[PDB]
């Protein structure tokens, strides 16, 4: 048959997955970010102790396939305020920063080389010489606007890719009052927000991407999709040589498998280990958001203790995690 909820089955008009819904804003909660933006590096598998009471393998080892996506810390480069109207949300104003790096300026041109690199010259010039206009616009946001969404762009420079145009999107700011959001937004201009300060290794997020294009079978694949209930297993830091070492493994190692991730590269930044599949192929930008709703199903609450992570060679049939161990087992080569 085929579900009727996913038609017209046509190519997505976007490459970066659009967040069509943000969590409900509650002023009792103070300020936080609600989304993020990463790159699917690839997937591996893990071994985990399963602390689910009543499950047939309570307190027993399982094996789980996990998706590793690299998320270099996003950089906040603007603030936007939406006003409630009878005709729907309407973007009232937009305010930017001074130093917009070349990575995000590339997003504004189809040809960065041939351009005169003239983006944001007058705005940045007037930004420095007269900040009263910026203050007036932020005053407007905190006086009229009800939804505050910050421009944040990902540092695609650090990713082991060939693209140079940074990705740009609007993260909403749930928490506090509208003034609190604007103060939070203004205090993070030209600074970077790290994923460790957005997700915490155990929560259950919703992953949004564009599916891998299978071709023409009408159109098949390359559709916008939204996996729900994707659970974080481990938020690793790119600076530590222990990001792929558990408490049951030691064995100083890095999440990148033997020989680099297939068709992606070497992950040397902050990464996220989600469970199971995620939409899209490798090296496609994925969007991560907090779950729109509170569901405390026991799978969403139970803690995770990874026992062992796999860094064998995914390019074939790998059988050695680390080059040191390969040398210890294999006899000394002629080289």
């Amino acid at each position: 048959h085929g579900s009727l909820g996913f038609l017209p089955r046509k190519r997505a008009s976007r490459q970066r997955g659009k967040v069509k819904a943000f969590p409900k804003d509650d002023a009792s909660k103070p300020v936080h970010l609600t989304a993020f933006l990463g790159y699917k590096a690839g997937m591996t598998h893990i071994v985990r102790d399963l602390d689910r009471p009543g499950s047939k393998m309570h307190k027993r080892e399982i094996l789980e396939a996990v998706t590793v996506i690299e998320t270099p810390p996003m950089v906040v480069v603007g603030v936007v305020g939406y006003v409630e109207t009878p005709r729907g949300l309407r973007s009232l104003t937009t305010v930017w920063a001074e130093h917009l790096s070349e990575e995000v300026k590339r997003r504004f041109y189809k040809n960065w080389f041939k351009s005169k690199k003239k983006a944001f010259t007058k705005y940045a010039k007037k930004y420095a010489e007269s900040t009263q206009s910026i203050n007036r616009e932020l005053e407007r946001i905190k006086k009229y606007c009800s939804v505050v969404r910050v421009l944040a762009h990902t540092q695609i420079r650090k990713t082991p890719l060939a693209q140079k145009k940074a990705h740009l999107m609007e993260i909403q700011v749930n928490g506090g009052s509208v003034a609190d959001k604007v103060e939070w937004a203004r205090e993070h201009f030209e600074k970077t927000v790290d994923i460790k300060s957005t997700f915490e290794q155990n929560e259950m997020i919703d992953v949004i991407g564009v599916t891998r294009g299978k071709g023409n079978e009408g159109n098949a694949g390359y559709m916008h999709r939204t996996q729900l209930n994707s659970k974080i297993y481990r938020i690793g830091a790119g600076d530590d040589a222990k990001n792929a070492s558990t408490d049951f493994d030691a064995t100083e190692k890095r999440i990148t498998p033997m020989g680099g991730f297939v068709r992606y590269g070497v992950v040397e930044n902050d990464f996220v280990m989600l469970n199971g599949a995620t939409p899209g192929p490798v090296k496609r930008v994925l969007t991560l958001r907090k779950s729109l709703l509170t569901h405390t199903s026991r799978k969403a609450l139970e803690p995770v203790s990874l026992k062992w992570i796999d860094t064998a060679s995914k390019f074939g049939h790998g059988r050695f995690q680390t080059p040191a161990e390969a040398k210890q087992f294999l006899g000394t080569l002629k080289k």
Partner: protein, 114 residues
């Protein structure tokens, strides 16, 4: 958490790789990859396969013995009570083994080449 040695190549089998095959003789065979599984299916003798550890040790391409550091390793079937002091030294002694074994086999290959 046990990394068993494959029956054919004698190479370590990490969780998630390879196959389990149980003989009707209640004997269990672990294979690291499909290459070794298929070779066993045609019933090639590992002593006569050019890329297995059993073949290599049948022709003396590795040292016959390493009683390294006066004790190296043994499969234990009578477990021991857990102790933080004992685990610490075993953790240190284990990695002190590998460098000794590597150091000795380096000179072993040097002797073999000459």
């Amino acid at each position: 958490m046990r990394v068993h040695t494959c029956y054919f190549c004698s190479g370590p089998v990490y969780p998630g790789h390879g196959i389990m095959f149980v003989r009707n003789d209640s004997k269990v065979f672990r294979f690291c990859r499909s290459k070794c599984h298929k070779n066993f299916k045609m019933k090639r003798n590992p002593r006569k396969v050019a890329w297995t550890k059993a073949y290599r040790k049948a022709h003396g391409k590795e040292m016959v013995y390493d009683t390294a550091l006066a004790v190296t390793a043994a499969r234990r079937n009578v477990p021991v009570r857990y102790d933080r002091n004992v685990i610490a030294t075993t953790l240190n002694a284990m990695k002190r083994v590998s460098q000794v074994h590597a150091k000795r086999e380096r000179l072993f290959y040097k002797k073999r080449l000459a």
